[PDB]
Every structure is written in C-alpha cells, then in structure tokens.
Amino acid sequence: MLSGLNHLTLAVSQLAPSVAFYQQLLGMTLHARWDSGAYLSCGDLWLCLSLDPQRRVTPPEESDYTHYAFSISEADFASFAARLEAAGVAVWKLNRSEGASHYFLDPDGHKLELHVGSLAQRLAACREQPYKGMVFF
Amino acid sequence: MLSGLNHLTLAVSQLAPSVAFYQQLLGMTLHARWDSGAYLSCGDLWLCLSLDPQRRVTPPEESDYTHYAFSISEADFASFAARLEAAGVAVWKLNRSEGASHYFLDPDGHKLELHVGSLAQRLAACREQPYKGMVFF
Ligand SMILES: CCOC(=O)/C=C/c1ccc(N)cc1
Ligand SMILES: CCOC(=O)/C=C\c1ccc(N)cc1
Numbered sequence: 001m002l003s004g005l006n007h008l009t010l011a012v013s014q015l016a017p018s019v020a021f022y023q024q025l026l027g028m029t030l031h032a033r034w035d036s037g038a039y040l041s042c043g044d045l046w047l048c049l050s051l052d053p054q055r056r057v058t059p060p061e062e063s064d065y066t067h068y069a070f071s072i073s074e075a076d077f078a079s080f081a082a083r084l085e086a087a088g089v090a091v092w093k094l095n096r097s098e099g100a101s102h103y104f105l106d107p108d109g110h111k112l113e114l115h116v117g118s119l120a121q122r123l124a125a126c127r128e129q130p131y132k133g134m135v136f137f
Numbered sequence: 138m139l140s141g142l143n144h145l146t147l148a149v150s151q152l153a154p155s156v157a158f159y160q161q162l163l164g165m166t167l168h169a170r171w172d173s174g175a176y177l178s179c180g181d182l183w184l185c186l187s188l189d190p191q192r193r194v195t196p197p198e199e200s201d202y203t204h205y206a207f208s209i210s211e212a213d214f215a216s217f218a219a220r221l222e223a224a225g226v227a228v229w230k231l232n233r234s235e236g237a238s239h240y241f242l243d244p245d246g247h248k249l250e251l252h253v254g255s256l257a258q259r260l261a262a263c264r265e266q267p268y269k270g271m272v273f274f
C-alpha cells in the first residue's frame with residue numbers, strides 16, 4: 001500500500017532565491033543543486049525545488065487553501081515565527097483555526113505553515129472544540 | 138528548528154469524491170470528517186482535505202510542476218498503478234528518471250505521484266551521473 005509522502009516538489013520561478021529561502025531562512029539542509037533544481041531535507045522530508053518557467057508568483061488571494069505545514073516544537077515556535085516576521089516574510093492567514101500555527105508565504109506564494117502538534121493531538125483538541133459537523137472514526 | 142512535514146493540506150472542490158479517492162481508491166485511513174474537510178493518514182503523513190469553493194478543477198497543462206509523491210514498494214507498484222488505470226485515473230507525465238514513478242491526477246487536478254526510492258538513492262544515482270550544473274553539499 002501507500003506508506004507516506006515520498007517527496008514534496010515545489011515549482012519555483014527563480015531557483016537561487018528559493019534555495020536561499022528554504023536553506024538560509026528556514027534552516028533546511030541543502031544536499032544538491034543543479035541548473036534546474038535543488039534537493040533539500042527537513043527531518044525526514046525530501047523537498048525538491050524544481051525550476052519551472054510556468055510557475056507564477058501568486059498572491060494568496062489568487063490561490064486556494066492548499067498548503068504545506070512544517071513541524072516545530074512548542075519551545076521554538078514563537079521565536080521562529082517572530083524571526084520570519086522581522087525578516088519581512090509575507091503572510092496569508094491570521095486566525096488559528098487548527099491550533100498553534102503561523103501562516104507564511106514562500107517567494108512564489110506557496111502557502112506554508114509552522115505548526116506545533118501531531119494529528120493525534122489535533123484530534124484530541126477537536127473532540128473538545130470540534131469543527132462544525134465533526135465525526136471521528 | 139523545523140523537524141519535518143507536519144501536514145499536507147489539499148483544497149478540494151467536492152468533499153465526497155475526494156474522500157472516496159484518498160480513502161477508498163488510494164487506501165488512506167480516514168480519521169475524521171466535518172462539514173468542510175477531512176483528516177486522513179498515510180503512514181506518517183497527515184493529510185487534510187479542505188473544502189474550498191476557490192478550488193478549480195485544473196487541467197494538468199494549466200498547473201505548474203508542483204506535485205506530491207507517495208511512497209510504495211517496488212513489489213506493490215505495478216498492481217497499484219493498474220488499480221489507478223482500472224479506475225480511469227488520468228496520467229499527467231511518463232517516467233524518465235531513476236526509480237519507478239507513476240504520475241496521476243486527483244479529482245481536482247492535484248498532481249500526484251507514486252515513487253519507489255529515497256533521497257539517498259536519488260543522490261547516489263546523481264553522484265554517478267550528475268545533472269547539468271550539479272553541485273553537492
Ligand atoms: C544555473 C546554475 O546552476 C548551479 O548549479 C549553480 C549553483 C551555484 C551555487 C552557489 C553559488 N553561489 C552560485 C551558483
Ligand atoms: C531567502 C533567504 O533569506 C534569508 O536568509 C534572509 C534572512 C535571514 C536572517 C536570519 C536568519 N536566521 C535566516 C535568514
């Protein structure tokens with residue numbers, strides 16, 4: 001069967017600024033780069049940045065809610081979010097509708113998130129404060 | 138410090154066909170559903186389906202290369218691909234890289250992939266046959 005996410009590939013319009021964002025600003029590990037892409041890791045996540053002439057820099061009001069959340073500890077969350085804010089990283093959402101999260105944009109407008117907590121923790125929180133119509137299996 | 142992918146959220150135009158696709162066709166575990174979304178798991182992956190009226194059913198020629206690859210074993214790959222083909226799931230690309238890959242579309246045109254092989258395997262192949270301009274770190 002399927003066993004998890006093998007990799008996340010993000011199309012990017014400008015390779016070097018995207019590599020810098022994920023490696024320098026977000027702290028991910030850069031393993032290789034080439035004329036048309038890069039490979040990074042974030043823990044066990046394999047991230048591929050793929051140079052794509054079709055990628056547009058997309059304002060958050062023009063894209064749907066598809067987004068990518070990265071795990072961070074409770075101890076590190078607030079100072080990492082504040083650093084992104086002080087660095088001028090654009091945002092796309094303010095209301096914490098799914099727990100402790102910080103919503104921010106990459107250089108092309110990919111919707112990213114810092115989140116504290118697992119799926120099990122989110123299910124437990126939702127039992128007390130469920131989303132409208134929620135059922136648990 | 139970021140420690141991995143926390144969750145992947147896909148915006149969906151119609152919740153019931155997307156739940157059918159990810160749970161029934163792709164075999165993911167459904168943990169909860171509410172009036173505007175669902176939570177599933179696939180191994181370590183926490184997947185959220187978020188009902189979003191801004192999601193367009195998007196032809197693959199009209200989206201960029203951003204895509205989401207799921208892990209499967211080599212032994213299971215061909216029968217899972219045949220299952221998707223029997224269900225009429227569209228393919229958006231042929232495989233031309235190392236490691237088996239099947240490139241298929243979700244009901245809203247999200248670009249998905251089945252892939253066999255790790256980042257380490259890809260890096261080993263690249264060190265033997267580097268892409269144009271490739272540098273390692
Ligand atoms: C199309 C370019 O392809 C490459 O692999 C370039 C890599 C690179 C890495 C670090 C630099 N300071 C400059 C260039
Ligand atoms: C596109 C990459 O931009 C940056 O890296 C900019 C600033 C920065 C400053 C302090 C940090 N701890 C990390 C990053």
Ligand SMILES: [Mn+2]
Pocket residue numbers: 067069098113144146
């Ligand atoms: Mn999220």
Ligand SMILES: [Mn+2]
Pocket residue numbers: 007009204206250
């Ligand atoms: Mn891929």
